[PDB]
């Protein structure tokens, strides 16, 4: 084998402790760059003029943040969707003031995670597996794309990307509620059904399988030792599990087919989260939650408030208070 | 392969209908988001200037021009948040554009009634609205039955492009597995990993 | 139960309704800053973590199946009473070990973990809400407030979020809490420029 | 920043005490007969 042939054999090698692969060839440097930039910025980045109004927001630990408050702050509203790599700045000081780390990090991250997904396919192919784990991973990934790329595109600025921080995340959420009434959007409700439901079925499945483990141990040892890695025989009794759950609700509401069950387990959270992601990604173009403001009117024409209108009042508080120095004109049009 | 391609095309169409006002004329599709934000800035620049404001020298609360400021490369642009949209271009705005961007003397002297009309129209037909088609910001009251065509087409095509990307992954991976002969599962008597050395 | 019992009345419990529940969420943000609460954060981690485990486990099983039939649709190639595992734990384990760095090797552990994560998450959130019954919130970082109080150039996403909370409270309180007879003159309402 | 001056010891003992408990248990597990 020549050098290229050997290299190809190593890259795609199934014997590497961590699979590399061709997707990995892109993934590794981008994720390393993104990670290093993120960590360094999170500790040491100076405040960033996120909203382009020469009002810099401090995101880093050394500039007065803790873990909950800390963030890598989104690039300046003055930049918008302009590509702002380090080399477009006259200096690192300028790059930092205008939030360059945000763009570097999110672009490398999105590239790297796309490659992570491809890499999941690739390894599944190398191991003779079915290929669709990566499709499940498409659910969280799309969501990241929604908040780091699609929303900024729709609104015309990366300053509207989700900040890389916990409280910044909350800021993004509150402002999103103010501007799109996301709670009242059916795609977000499907998202919620997705994660609540995902958790429910995770706990449920966990509990039923745990409930029907076959006795292989004594009381003075963990039941986990009752299973040996790679054993051929199933470690629990699915017939008993189904017997239980089928009586808990009713027979035909219970899975007796493990494959159908696990497919359901995969599909519910993945599809739901796909809808969450599409929710963010379509509210990115301002097709917003249901608006029932003043939907209920009495015979004279008096407005009769519903819970939607109270939501509306909260939303109003959010709208009027956010970015208190950024608006000169009465409507927030993007 | 075709699913991948169509997904890509879907996203491209989404951005096309969201930003482009040439093959998607605002006369027919409504203003773009950028167009409408710029149109608001234009509207109030006009209003306040009519009232006697010197819009070139008007300093906003932040220190930036209330009506007019510089882009990061120095071009004269509308100020406030619409600073993000300075790349917007439209037939109603361009006559006010000079070599260095928005021209203050043209603004002071050359704004025509049709421009005021157009800016007001687009400002008040911004592509914002609820799913039940209540026009405007999320806190707006019921009154106006409006969602911009730009929003319907962008949202629909993002959803479609995304699920087609999903379909691409599903079918490319299945085609690979089926071609290699394990789309139906692992051969119990020939499990590949069992013939591989342990990782540790 | 516990939350309204700690508050003035049942009035401030969630109302049984979709939009009402959303209102309950936004109230908790504006008044309790409930997102900032580490018990809620553990709740979130447990819910999203549970959904992650659900999805990843379902997909892993579905993509490490043994071929037990001739059908390209693989669901029929399972029998409830069969002794054998329907999917390969060994192959799954290698896959994730090479992809993610670690992998389950013990199915009993895997499934107990699937119980543990969302249940524990919800329980933590319950503890936090118990705190909120008494208005014992994680609302503020005192160091943050002292710094921001002395330094009007000091800004974090935390302070921005508090501005949002203050807006929520002032704009929603009169209609959300009609028994208080709130009258907030236009001039007292907190607002930024223009909006 | 005007942080709580006990936050350091609180965090340090919060990490160290159970971590140490676990290390004790692990290490005494390893040294048992194979």
């Amino acid at each position: 084998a020549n050098l290229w042939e050997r290299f190809c054999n190593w890259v795609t090698s199934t014997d590497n402790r961590l699979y590399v692969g061709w997707f990995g060839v892109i993934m590794i440097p981008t994720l390393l760059a993104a990670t290093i930039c993120f960590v360094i910025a999170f500790i040491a980045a100076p405040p960033v003029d996120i909203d382009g109004i020469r009002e810099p927001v401090s995101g880093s630990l050394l500039y007065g943040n803790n873990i909950i408050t800390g963030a890598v702050v989104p690039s300046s509203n003055a930049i918008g969707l302009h590509f702002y790599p380090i080399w477009e700045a006259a200096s690192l000081d300028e790059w930092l003031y205008n939030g360059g780390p945000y763009q570097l990090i999110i672009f490398h991250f999105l590239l790297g995670a796309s490659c992570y997904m491809g890499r999941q396919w690739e390894l599944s192919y190398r191991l003779g597996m079915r290929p669709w784990i990566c499709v499940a991973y498409s659910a969280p990934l799309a969501s990241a794309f929604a908040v780091f790329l699609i929303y900024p595109i729709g609104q015309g600025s990366f300053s509207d990307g989700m900040p890389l921080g916990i409280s910044g995340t909350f800021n993004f959420m509150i402002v999103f509620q103010a501007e799109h009434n996301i709670l009242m959007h059916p795609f977000h409700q499907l998202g919620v059904a997705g994660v609540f439901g995902g958790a429910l079925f995770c706990a449920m499945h966990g509990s039923l399988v745990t409930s029907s483990l076959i006795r292989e141990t004594t009381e003075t040892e963990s039941a986990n030792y009752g299973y040996k890695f790679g054993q051929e025989e199933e470690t629990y009794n699915i017939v008993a599990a189904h017997g239980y759950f089928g009586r808990l609700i009713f027979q035909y509401a219970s899975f007796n087919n493990s494959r159908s069950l696990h497919f359901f387990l995969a599909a519910w959270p993945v599809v739901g989260v796909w809808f969450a992601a599409l929710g963010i990604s379509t509210m990115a173009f301002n097709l917003n939650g249901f608006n029932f403001n003043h939907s209920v009117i009495d015979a004279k024409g008096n407005v009769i408030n519903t819970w939607a209108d109270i939501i509306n009042r909260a939303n109003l508080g959010m709208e009027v208070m956010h970015e208190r120095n950024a608006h000169n004109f009465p409507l927030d049009l993007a | 392969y075709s699913l991948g391609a169509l997904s890509m095309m879907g996203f491209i169409a989404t951005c096309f209908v969201w930003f482009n006002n040439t093959v998607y004329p605002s006369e027919f599709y409504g203003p773009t988001g950028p167009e409408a934000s710029q149109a608001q800035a234009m509207t109030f620049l006009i209003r306040d200037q009519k009232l006697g404001a010197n819009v070139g020298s008007a300093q906003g609360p932040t220190g930036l021009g209330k009506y007019l400021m510089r882009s990061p490369t120095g071009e004269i642009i509308f100020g406030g948040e619409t600073m993000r949209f300075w790349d917007f271009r439209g037939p109603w705005l361009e006559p006010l554009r000079g070599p260095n961007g928005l021209d203050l003397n043209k603004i002071k002297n050359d704004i025509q009634p049709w421009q005021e009309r157009r800016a007001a129209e687009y400002m008040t037909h911004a592509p914002l609205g609820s799913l039940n088609s209540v026009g405007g910001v999320a806190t707006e009251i019921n009154s106006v039955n409006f969602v911009s065509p730009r929003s319907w087409l962008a949202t629909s095509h993002f959803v479609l492009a995304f699920f087609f990307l999903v379909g691409h992954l599903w079918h490319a991976g299945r085609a690979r597995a089926a071609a290699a002969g394990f789309e139906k599962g692992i051969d119990r008597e020939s499990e590949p990993v069992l013939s591989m050395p342990s990782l540790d | 139960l516990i939350y309204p019992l700690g508050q003035s009345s049942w009035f401030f419990a969630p109302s049984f309704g979709v939009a009402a529940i959303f209102r309950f969420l936004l109230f908790f943000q504006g008044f309790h800053n409930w997102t900032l609460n580490p018990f809620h954060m553990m709740g979130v981690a447990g819910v999203l973590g549970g959904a992650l485990l659900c999805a990843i486990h379902g997909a892993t099983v579905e993509n490490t199946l043994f071929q037990d039939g001739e059908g390209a649709s693989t669901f029929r190639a399972f029998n409830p009473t069969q002794a054998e595992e329907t999917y390969s734990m060994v192959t799954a384990n290698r896959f994730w070990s090479q992809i993610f760095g670690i992998a389950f090797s013990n199915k009993r552990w895997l499934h107990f973990f699937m119980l543990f994560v969302p249940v524990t998450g919800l329980w933590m959130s319950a503890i936090g809400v118990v705190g909120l019954a008494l208005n014992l919130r994680s609302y503020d970082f005192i160091s943050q407030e002292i710094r921001a109080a002395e330094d009007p150039e000091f800004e974090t996403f935390y302070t921005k979020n508090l501005l949002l909370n203050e807006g929520i409270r002032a704009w929603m309180a009169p209609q959300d809490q009609p028994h208080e007879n709130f009258v907030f003159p236009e001039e007292v309402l907190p607002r930024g420029n223009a909006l | 920043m005007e942080v709580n001056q006990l936050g350091l010891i609180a965090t340090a003992l919060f990490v160290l005490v159970p971590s140490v408990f676990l290390i004790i248990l692990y290490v005494q597990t390893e040294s048992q007969q194979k």
Binding site: - | S198, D200 | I102 | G7
Partner: peptide, 30 residues
């Protein structure tokens, strides 16, 4: 001192990732 604490805990977590991956107890088929 806060920052030192936060970064320290983070670094401990990353090191933990390292040991948990490369120095895990190996899975063995019995």
């Amino acid at each position: 001192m806060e920052t030192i604490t936060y970064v320290f805990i983070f670094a401990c977590i990353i090191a933990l990732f390292f040991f948990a991956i490369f120095f895990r107890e190996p899975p063995r088929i019995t």
